[PDB]
Amino acid sequence: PGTEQYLLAKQLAKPKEKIPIIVGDYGPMWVYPTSTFDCVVADPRKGSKMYGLKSYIEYQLTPTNTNRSVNHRYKHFDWLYERLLVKFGSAIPIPSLPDKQVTGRFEEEFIKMRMERLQAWMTRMCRHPVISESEVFQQFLNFRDEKEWKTGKRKAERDELAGVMIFSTMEPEAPDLDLVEIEQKCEAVGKFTKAMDDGVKELLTVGQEHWKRCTGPLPKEYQKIGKALQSLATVFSSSGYQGETDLNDAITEAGKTYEEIASLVAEQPKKDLHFLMECNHEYKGFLGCFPDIIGTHKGAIEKVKESDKLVATSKITLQDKQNMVKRVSIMSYALQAEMNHFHSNRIYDYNSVIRLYLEQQVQFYETIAEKLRQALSRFPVM
Amino acid sequence: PGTEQYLLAKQLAKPKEKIPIIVGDYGPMWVYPTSTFDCVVADPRKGSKMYGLKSYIEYQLTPTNTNRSVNHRYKHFDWLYERLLVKFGSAIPIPSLPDKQVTGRFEEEFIKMRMERLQAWMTRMCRHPVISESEVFQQFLNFRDEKEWKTGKRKAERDELAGVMIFSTMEPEAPDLDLVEIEQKCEAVGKFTKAMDDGVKELLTVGQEHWKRCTGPLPKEYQKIGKALQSLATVFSSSGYQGETDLNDAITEAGKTYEEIASLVAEQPKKDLHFLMECNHEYKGFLGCFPDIIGTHKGAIEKVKESDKLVATSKITLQDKQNMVKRVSIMSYALQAEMNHFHSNRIYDYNSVIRLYLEQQVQFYETIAEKLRQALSRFPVM
């Protein structure tokens, strides 16, 4: 990338953007604020900018820290996204913003799932100790003037403390880590993320595959059954046999009961499978970011090996050399700090969605059973 | 066929084979005995007839009416079948004997399902008021000598009171039915049977179709899921993050729990779907028989219209004519008697198998739910 600039920044900077790293039992970690805060996103408003029949949708972001609300069209979130990506992208994975879809810009469904994805996206950022308390993200929320905003959007776009340079604002409340120990922690992350990425990509495929099967061919079956039964009852009823009436009703109902199971089935993924899928997508997103983060640390560590080769070729000085070291260490502390935040949240997230998927599953089968048990109690015992 | 022979039997016969038809509220019906009797078929024996490695399987038929047991190889049942078909085939549907299969003459599975089908086949006959008390069927059971049998098999094969002639042994304890009323009851049966046949053929197709889907692709899914989960837990476990251990166990178990659901699923049709299918096959069998029965009555009724045309062309006499009538009436009474036995049993049969299928279904879903509910109670709440 350009690590040469940060590790060789002969001229140290004078910014007071606070990004500290402390150590702990689990190892380095960011400093999580004591006064936590989230943010709500809802009430799909409708704004206007003079083009006739071209009014973009606008969402409302209500922070919790101060109750003062704000509005934002999707395009602004994308803007926010690029900024966060450009600023911290070389150290912190940045949640993916949903695709730019099927030209269905205006109805219930669309805005709903989109607003759902934006809500989860905002909460991710709010929960991040480093992102949540940055200027760009913050100002993105609390702004009054329609121009107080343009000012921020402008200030944001000129912030040169991005890319690799972001590390220049980090302060490790701990010693230096030799190059060896560094490269090792790098490999580790690189092997975990690649592994989990590969793993979640499957969980996603079978799920999408199972989904597609529960909303299609499977219901049709229970539909064919329930109908097959009902036609048969219809045939018996034409028999014209003295001494029957009670059975053809039980049959016909069994069929209708099956038709309802067809519906119940074809309408279940939206209640459990869905959340399990979404959680995995979000994570496929965090993972997709490591290729860059790790590739940048790798380049940084590789560029520090040439230190000696350089100092000898009289290109730089021992002081310059010793900086490259104390500097690429900060990178490691930041990387470890990030993973520790990852794992922490990973463990919470999967434990909640799975817990959720199962619960929904349970109720599902329990419900179907109860539906059968009803049509059953319509056929006299023998 | 040959109805000309029965309706024009100038020379009445002198047999005392009792086959009476009485009337009732539901209309004509056979005379059902007061001392009912069934028969058991089990204990797959092994007999021998000097060819080396070619020992045919032999079953044991234990009547209930007298506890005196007997043996019979499949080939004998086929023999019994043809006789019953030849003797009463023009009036009573004869249950189909299972196909002659995949050259798997010797193991657990084969003899089991075959013996299951033979058992149900025997019980059908025993339950039939007319068949159960016939000479051929009876002697088929109670015989001691290995030669007392050959005698019967011989007597059976020379019984000319078959085909259309079987009606000659029937005695209606009721008046004559004009030709009109006859043709009408004929059409009716012909329209019901064709209808139900068409109807059961579908129930059979979707069932076979659903079956094939529960024993194949559906389990593989729950298998892919359960594995996808387990690989993921495996990945988390390599994380090397301080502060986790409890989750990877819950996950891994969830997967294994799903794998078991794959098995449970792929092994369910043998517990319910199966009986529902078998019942329908048996009935597709009874129905397949009406094409002949009805075609024979149709020919008989058609041949009676030429009565007048004949009597005038001086071919036969008024007495001959009046016989054809009183005679084709007996046919109608026998046909109605048979249907009434059909409907009676139809209503009982479907009400029991469906009642059975549902019950099994219920327990199925209830069981799966309980399996999930277990893996669930392994993930701590939040």
Write a concise keyword list for the protein shown above.
homodimer; 382 residues; mainly alpha; PX Domain; Substrate Binding Domain Of Dnak, Chain:A, Domain 2; 3 domains; three-stranded antiparallel β-sheet; 6 strands; structural protein; PX domain; BAR domain; dimeric
Notes on the structure:
Two copies of one chain form a homodimer. By secondary structure, the first copy, chain A, is mainly alpha-helical. The first copy, chain A, has three domains: 1-32 and 159-174, no CATH class; 33-158, Phox-like domain (PX Domain, 2-Layer Sandwich); 175-382, Substrate Binding Domain Of Dnak, Chain:A, Domain 2 (Up-down Bundle). Chain A has twelve helices and six strands. The first copy, chain A, has helices at 4-7, 74-88, 108-126, 135-141, 148-157, 179-214, 217-236, 246-266, 273-288, 290-303, 306-312, 318-376, and strands at 19-22, 29-30, 39-46, 57-63, 70-73, 170-172. Chain A has a three-stranded mixed sheet, with helices on one face. A three-stranded antiparallel sheet of chain A has the order 3-4-5. In chain A, strand 1 and strand 2 (29-30) form a beta hairpin. In chain A, helix 6 (179-214) runs antiparallel to helix 10 (290-303) and helix 8 runs antiparallel to helix 12 (318-376). The longest helix of chain A is centred in the last third of the chain and has 59 residues, at 318-376. The radius of gyration of chain A is 29 Å and the shape is elongated. Chain A starts with a helix and ends in a 6-residue tail after the last helix. At the A-B interface, helix 6, helix 7, helix 8 and helix 12 of A face helix 6, helix 7, helix 8 and helix 12 of B. Chains A, B: It is a peripheral membrane protein. Chains A, B: It is found in: Cytoplasmic vesicle membrane; Cell membrane; Cytoplasmic vesicle, Clathrin-coated vesicle; Golgi apparatus, trans-Golgi network.
